[PDB]
Enzyme design. Sequence first.
Site, PDB file in Angstrom:
ATOM      1  N   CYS A 250       0.837  -1.191   0.000  1.00 33.45           N
ATOM      2  CA  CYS A 250       0.000   0.000   0.000  1.00 33.45           C
ATOM      3  C   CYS A 250       0.876   1.246   0.000  1.00 33.45           C
ATOM      4  O   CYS A 250       1.697   1.430   0.908  1.00 33.45           O
ATOM      5  CB  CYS A 250      -0.923   0.004   1.212  1.00 33.45           C
ATOM      6  SG  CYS A 250      -1.839   1.571   1.456  1.00 33.45           S
TER       7      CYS A 250
ATOM      8  N   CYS B 135       0.589   3.697   2.915  1.00 31.45           N
ATOM      9  CA  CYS B 135       1.238   3.096   4.077  1.00 31.45           C
ATOM     10  C   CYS B 135       2.737   3.368   4.084  1.00 31.45           C
ATOM     11  O   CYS B 135       3.316   3.658   5.140  1.00 31.45           O
ATOM     12  CB  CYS B 135       0.986   1.589   4.103  1.00 31.45           C
ATOM     13  SG  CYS B 135      -0.699   1.109   4.477  1.00 31.45           S
TER      14      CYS B 135
END
Length: 113
Positions: free
Chosen positions: A36, A39
């Site tokens: 991600c 992230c």
Amino acid sequence: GTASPDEPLYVQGQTELDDVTSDNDVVLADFYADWCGPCQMLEPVVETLAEQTDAAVAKIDVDENQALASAYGVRGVPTLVLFADGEQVEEVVGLQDEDALKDLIESYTELVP
């Protein structure tokens, strides 16, 4: 005095999380996935928060801690959960900017009214 937790802690499993939330008054738990993008952008940010605030920072891989994530209502990434005295008190989702997260932490690491 003693050495403070000034770098993020990778946490796997409930026992490890309980150890951090019981040994540190305020904990920012960063629930992430390595695939991600937002992230990964949070990684330098929560590093700075561990270095600059009194919160301990825990990093939890949701793919390796599915049931742990579900137990805290984590249903996507990024999700950050704030603990105070071992209690979940805040949950924010999505990319949160560094100043907003610092302000969130300080509303618990400092006396308010």
